[PDB]
Structures are given as structure tokens and as C-alpha cells.
Design a protein around this ligand. Structure first.
Ligand code: GDP
Ligand code: MG
Lengths: 360, 180
């Protein structure tokens, strides 16, 4: 029976999903009850996903689904949009066009993301090894595809409304060290989620490792400079540090606000750390660590969120326990985000040099 | 004390699960949980006879047509349900559910249940149907469908107000332990 309900789910998503992708607010307000009852796409889709809750072997895939169906869409979890006569129906009836439209967009992106489940089911239709790993969701917000930059779903960061962002909490020898992620995607929604995380997590600070040159050739948004407003969040950051040339480090002061809430956070922008390379001197890495040092963890990112970012975090560990096994650190970090953490050899060399100097 | 197996079927969303939970726990569901398949239990005394009642929840969607039948073996009595405020769920009683149940449960008793009694006289619900040129199913109509398919009884109820709930199951048991 596990194999047949697996096939009920595959054929069901293949045709239900493209339907949710074509939803429009007006056509929906007028037909929600039908879609959420009998053989309609919304109810039928939620039922098919329940199939995986009956198969203990699909544990990984089930945790993934559960996360998606618990995301808030109106004033309820997405899963409550599969039924009639309850909270969603009451809400939809009196929702304003503006409210209805934002809800419709969430359904579009969640529908699309749910095609990754279709893909796993098709693999099982051929060589059927029940996967024991599933990257967490990206909902159109990640800069890189998960096939190139995977995301550990157990340690992925989640906003208070259920929304997962492309960032992981790194840990070593049993304790968390910092929040690591890739350079934010140039999108209102991608940028809003980012800022939102900084204050909800109350990060001690924000560290940025990409040079001006790279932010150029790749066109990476300088959101930590002026002032902007994404969704319902606005940012005010002013440069506090020195003159012009020799931009070892530029320090800023950031004030964030989401509704009636505010939060202040210092920003450190490193400017002479080339991609795929170490810093100019061991002393510099050692000093940067003390600076950063001076819930409540630092948030760090380069471009991919795996190389330079890994190195920076490991240096924080060394400061407090200089005898720390760097081989163990790399292993624990990889188990916290993905297997590319600290993939550049030359940077691992600089770290061991910082260790040695420090014990001196 | 004896045991009795009862199976519950009908179109998706007519309230099968809400009906079962209200009756066994005395509380309406706090949230919506899609049903693939499930089992519930209850201990009741009816007409002086102690009975342990076995209840089987099913999936009404049509892509489950080949899986649902695995629940029918050894059934003592079946409940075919349709929502008093959804005429299409009512038409499918004769076009699908009656034919499927009689085929797998050659000859055990069927009870026809009209659900969501509390919405039949509800203005907001009535005006909604009015648009699609529709109207609620009346008691006379339900009784008429019951005779057309051979059901031993026609009963209406509400999971939300709990009115008529106890009676459905007392009568389900009664039809099984019934004298000639
Ligand atoms: N007013 C009202 N709503 C009901 C009643 N029963 C179920 N509902 C609603 O209709 C939906 C479908 O019920 P459910 O038990 O999941 O249907 P099933 O698909 O046949 O299991 C629920 O989400 C409830 O909000 C009822 O007796 N009165
Ligand atoms: Mg159900």
C-alpha cells in the first residue's frame, strides 16, 4: 500500500500544482469554496501531501512538507486553505483586494517550490532509494540553486511567521557560533526577509566580506550603506569609520524598524579579502576577530556563504579556545550548513598559522 | 460486550471527520486535518447492551477510488454522507457512493446521513447558493433519495451543535443487532 499511495501523490501534484500557479484573486474570492471542497485543487492537494505522513521511511521529505504547509498565508497556516467553512473562508469573504493579492502571491511561490517534491517522487519511480537528505526550502529567495549551495533543513533559520530564509546556524563542540548565509538576492522580498532576521534574532552584528570590485562585476546590492525600505522594513545606516583609502574595514551604524519595533546593529564591511584567497596577514585575521567579538550571535556572509564565511567563524572559535581542533571545527560546520564550508585550502592554512601564533 | 465495525463514506469535505471527533471526544476539531484513512473507538450502552464500536474514516477524492475499498472487508453497517448545503454531493449518492458500497458490501445495512444541519437555515449560506441558481436539500428530498437506494434509515445532524449525533450511532448499532 505504500507504493500505491506514493503513485497517488505523484499523479496528483503533477496536475494540481500547475493549477494553483494560475490562480488570480478575483476568480478565487468567487470560487474559493469550490477549490476547498470535493475534488477541487486546494483540498485535493492537501490530501495528497498527507500520504507521506503514513510512510515512516519518508521522514526527511515529510519534515520538509510540514515546514511548507505551516507557513502563514492569510492569518492562518497554508494547510488551513484546504478546507471550507472555517477561518480562511471567513477571512477571504471580507479580505480587501490588497490583502487578497498578497496572499495569492504566497500560494504561487509555495506551489512552485512544491515541485521539488514531485522531483523526489519521480526518482523513486525509477531507482527507489528513499533519500535521507533534503535541503530546506528557498521559495524564490536564494541567490544560488540548492544543487550548487545546499541548506541543512534542521539548522535553517525561520522567521516568526514560519518563513524559512537562506541562512543556517553554525555550531561547534555543542555550541552555536554564528548565522551563515549567501549574499542576499536583489529582490524586495529577498531583502526584506534578511533585515527582518537581523532584528528578530537580535544579532550582535553584521559582517560583509565581498570587495567593491566583486560587488561590481556581479552587481551586488549595497544595502548596508544608504537608506531604503523593503516591504515594511526601512534601514538607516551611517558610516562611522575613517577617511578614504586603505579601506581595511568600514564600520557603520544601522537602525532597523518593522512596525513599532526598532533595533540597532553595527556593520563591519571587510574590503581587502579576495575571493578564494586568505587575508594579507595572519595579524589581520586575528584583529578582525577581536573586532567582531567587541540569539545575540554575529551574522556573516561573503558571496556563496561557504568559503571566507567559514574561515571568519572558525577564527572566532580560536580566540576563546586556541587549542581547538580545526579538523573538528570544519567537520561540525559542514554538518551545520553543507559540505562546502571552508572548501578553500589556502584559508585553512592561515587559520592554523593563527592558532600557532596565538599559543605563542 | 460485543464489537461492531462501522464505515463512513461520501464526497470530500461533507464533514465526516468533524462528525466522528465530536461524537467520540465531545469537542469539535480545533484545526483541519486531511484524512487519507483513520480509526476511532467508542464504548456505549444502547438499549441495555454494552458495545465497543469500531469506526472507519475514509478519503472521498476520486484518485483514492482504488485504495478506499480496502476498508470495506467485514463491515457490519455503512453510513453514506452528503452535505445538506451541497446539491452536487447529494447527486453523487446515487451516481457513485450507493453503487460502490453495495458492490463491496453485498448485503449489510446502509444509513443515509445529511450533514451540517446548522447551515440549512443560514442566510449567508442561502444567498451564496442563490447565485449559482442553487438551493439547500430539504428533508423530504433526503427521505426520497433514501428510499431510492434502499437505505434502512434517513437521519440529519450537526457536528458543530452536536444535535442528532448520538442518535445516528444508536441507530447504526440498532440496525445491526436488529430482530426479524
Ligand atoms: N457549520 C458547520 N461546519 C461543519 C460541520 N462539519 C464539518 N464542518 C466544516 O466543513 C469542513 C469539512 O469537514 P471534514 O470533517 O474535514 O470533512 P470530510 O472531508 O468529509 O472529512 C471542516 O473544515 C469544518 O469547518 C458542521 O456540522 N457544521
Ligand atoms: Mg476527512
Amino acid at each position: 500500500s505504500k507504493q500505491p499511495l506514493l503513485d497517488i501523490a505523484l499523479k496528483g501534484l503533477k496536475r494540481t500544482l500547475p493549477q494553483l500557479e494560475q490562480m488570480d484573486g478575483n476568480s478565487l474570492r468567487e470560487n474559493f469554496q469550490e477549490m476547498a471542497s470535493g475534488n477541487g485543487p486546494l483540498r485535493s492537494l492537501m490530501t495528497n501531501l498527507q500520504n507521506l505522513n503514513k510512510i515512516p521511511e519518508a521522514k526527511q521529505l515529510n519534515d520538509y512538507v510540514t515546514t511548507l504547509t505551516n507557513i502563514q498565508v492569510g492569518v492562518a497556516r497554508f494547510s488551513q486553505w484546504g478546507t471550507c467553512g472555517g477561518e480562511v473562508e471567513r477571512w477571504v469573504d471580507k479580505a480587501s483586494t490588497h490583502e487578497l493579492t498578497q496572499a495569492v502571491k504566497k500560494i504561487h511561490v509555495i506551489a512552485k517550490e512544491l515541485k521539488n517534491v514531485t522531483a523526489e517522487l519521480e526518482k523513486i519511480e525509477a531507482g527507489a532509494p528513499m533519500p535521507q537528505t533534503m535541503s530546506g526550502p528557498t521559495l524564490g529567495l536564494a541567490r544560488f540553486a540548492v544543487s550548487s549551495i545546499p541548506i541543512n533543513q534542521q539548522t535553517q533559520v525561520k522567521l516568526s511567521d514560519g518563513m524559512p530564509v537562506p541562512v543556517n546556524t553554525l555550531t561547534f563542540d555543542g555550541k552555536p557560533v554564528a548565522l551563515a548565509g549567501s549574499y542576499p538576492k536583489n529582490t524586495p522580498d529577498a531583502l526584506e526577509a534578511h533585515m527582518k532576521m537581523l532584528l528578530e534574532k537580535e544579532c550582535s552584528c553584521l559582517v560583509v566580506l565581498t570587495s567593491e570590485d566583486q560587488m561590481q562585476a556581479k552587481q551586488l546590492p549595497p544595502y548596508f550603506r544608504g537608506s531604503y525600505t523593503f516591504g515594511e522594513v526601512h534601514t538607516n545606516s551611517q558610516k562611522v569609520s575613517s577617511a578614504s583609502q586603505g579601506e581595511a574595514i568600514d564600520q557603520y551604524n544601522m537602525q532597523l524598524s518593522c512596525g513599532e519595533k526598532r533595533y540597532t546593529i553595527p556593520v563591519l564591511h571587510v574590503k581587502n579579502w579576495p575571493d578564494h584567497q586568505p587575508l594579507p596577514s595572519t595579524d589581520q585575521l586575528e584583529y578582525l576577530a577581536d573586532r567582531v567579538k567587541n540569539k545575540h550571535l554575529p551574522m556573516i556572509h561573503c558571496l556563496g556563504g561557504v568559503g571566507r564565511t567559514g574561515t571568519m567563524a572558525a577564527a572566532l572559535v580560536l580566540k576563546d579556545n586556541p587549542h581547538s581542533n580545526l579538523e573538528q571545527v570544519r567537520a561540525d560546520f559542514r554538518d551545520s550548513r553543507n559540505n562546502r564550508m571552508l572548501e578553500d585550502a589556502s584559508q585553512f592554512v592561515q587559520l592554523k598559522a593563527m592558532q600557532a601564533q596565538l599559543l605563542m | 460486550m460485543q464489537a461492531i465495525k462501522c464505515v463512513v463514506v461520501g464526497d470530500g469535505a461533507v464533514g465526516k471527520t468533524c462528525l466522528l471527533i465530536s461524537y467520540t471526544t465531545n469537542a469539535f476539531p480545533g484545526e483541519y486535518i486531511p484524512t487519507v484513512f483513520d480509526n476511532y473507538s467508542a464504548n456505549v450502552m444502547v438499549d441495555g447492551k454494552p458495545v465497543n464500536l469500531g469506526l472507519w474514516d475514509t478519503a472521498g477524492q476520486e484518485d483514492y477510488d482504488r485504495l478506499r475499498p480496502l476498508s470495506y472487508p467485514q463491515t457490519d453497517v455503512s453510513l453514506i454522507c452528503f452535505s445538506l448545503v451541497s446539491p452536487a454531493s447529494f447527486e453523487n449518492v446515487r451516481a457513485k457512493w450507493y453503487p460502490e458500497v453495495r458492490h463491496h458490501c453485498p448485503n449489510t445495512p446502509i444509513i443515509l446521513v445529511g450533514t451540517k444541519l446548522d447551515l440549512r437555515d443560514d442566510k449567508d449560506t442561502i444567498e451564496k447558493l442563490k447565485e449559482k441558481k442553487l438551493t439547500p436539500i430539504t428533508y423530504p428530498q433526503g427521505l426520497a433519495m433514501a428510499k431510492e437506494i434502499g437505505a434502512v434509515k434517513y437521519l440529519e445532524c450537526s457536528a458543530l451543535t452536536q444535535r442528532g449525533l448520538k442518535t445516528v450511532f444508536d441507530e447504526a448499532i440498532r440496525a445491526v443487532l436488529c430482530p426479524p
